[PDB]
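About this split. The held-out portion is used to measure sequence recovery: a designer receives only the structure tokens and must propose an amino acid at every position. Recovery is the fraction of positions where the proposal matches the reference. Here is one held-out target exactly as it appears in the evaluation file.
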């Protein structure tokens, strides 16, 4: 799994370099997909997918799914290190 690490109070930026195209590639969290929100800053470049959650504390930690058409990968995202 494509692992990312954050701290309780900072920002959460997930940048992928998977083997998938533009798609559109989807972002999931705890089973349910994320939409382009004021706190959820998305970017779609295919081989580079960016999910940015503003304010990584508790509910922002979890397993994400960067669902590429041919190359769907899970993110082990832990908000840790006080």
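Reference sequence for scoring:
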């Amino acid at each position: 799994m494509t692992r990312v690490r954050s701290t309780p109070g900072g920002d959460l930026e997930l940048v992928v370099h998977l083997s998938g195209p533009g798609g559109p590639v989807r972002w999931y969290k705890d089973g349910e997909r994320l939409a382009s929100q004021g706190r959820v800053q998305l970017e779609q470049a295919g081989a580079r997918q960016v999910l940015r959650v503003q304010g990584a504390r508790s509910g922002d930690a979890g397993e994400y799914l960067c669902d590429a058409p041919q190359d769907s990968r899970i993110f082990l995202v832990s908000v840790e290190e006080p």
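Annotator remark: The first strand starts at residue 4 and ends at 6.
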